[PDB]
């Protein structure tokens, strides 16, 4: 997450990118580099349901209080925009996570216009499963 752009510049150059075809390469290049998902993590109790595809997430709290993600899917477009959530929610602690209205930054980005129902439900499923996940936390 550290190799890939902060909320800020994510969105920033989603506002730059000239049309759909930009925007449709950027999910993708930007889905191939999240980190591989350790093998042990592919286990039912972190799959992710709704997205027509396969998807994983696994959300662990630090000692430091701050919620990491990783995750995988086999189809690109749903692993970048997974990418584009775990962006949105780097270094939030659970309780931001809870909080943090993400559909103001969701439409200035202006990408499920783009999406087929298919990958807009697998979207907001994603974020879905990572919020409840979130507000279980202490």
């Given at each position: 997450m550290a190799?890939?752009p902060?909320?800020?510049k994510?969105?920033?150059?989603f506002?730059?990118?000239?049309?759909?075809e930009?925007?449709?390469?950027?999910?993708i290049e930007?889905?191939?580099?999240?980190?591989?998902?350790?093998?042990?993590?592919?286990?039912?109790?972190?799959?992710i349901?709704?997205c027509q595809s396969?998807?994983?997430?696994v959300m662990r709290?630090?000692?430091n209080?701050?919620?990491?993600?990783?995750?995988d899917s086999?189809?690109?477009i749903?692993?970048?925009?997974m990418?584009?959530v775990?962006i949105?929610?780097?270094?939030?602690t659970?309780?931001d996570?809870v909080?943090?209205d993400?559909?103001?930054?969701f439409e200035?980005?202006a990408?499920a216009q783009?999406?087929?129902p298919?990958?807009?439900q697998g979207?907001?499923?994603m974020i879905?499963?990572?919020?409840?996940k979130?507000a279980?936390?202490s």
């Amino acid at each position: 997450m550290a190799a890939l752009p902060d909320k800020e510049k994510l969105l920033r150059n989603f506002t730059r990118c000239a049309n759909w075809e930009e925007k449709y390469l950027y999910i993708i290049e930007l889905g191939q580099r999240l980190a591989e998902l350790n093998p042990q993590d592919r286990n039912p109790q972190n799959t992710i349901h709704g997205c027509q595809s396969q998807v994983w997430i696994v959300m662990r709290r630090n000692a430091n209080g701050i919620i990491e993600l990783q995750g995988d899917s086999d189809a690109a477009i749903v692993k970048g925009l997974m990418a584009v959530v775990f962006i949105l929610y780097h270094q939030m602690t659970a309780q931001d996570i809870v909080h943090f209205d993400v559909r103001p930054w969701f439409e200035k980005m202006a990408l499920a216009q783009h999406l087929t129902p298919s990958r807009s439900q697998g979207l907001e499923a994603m974020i879905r499963a990572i919020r409840a996940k979130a507000a279980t936390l202490s």
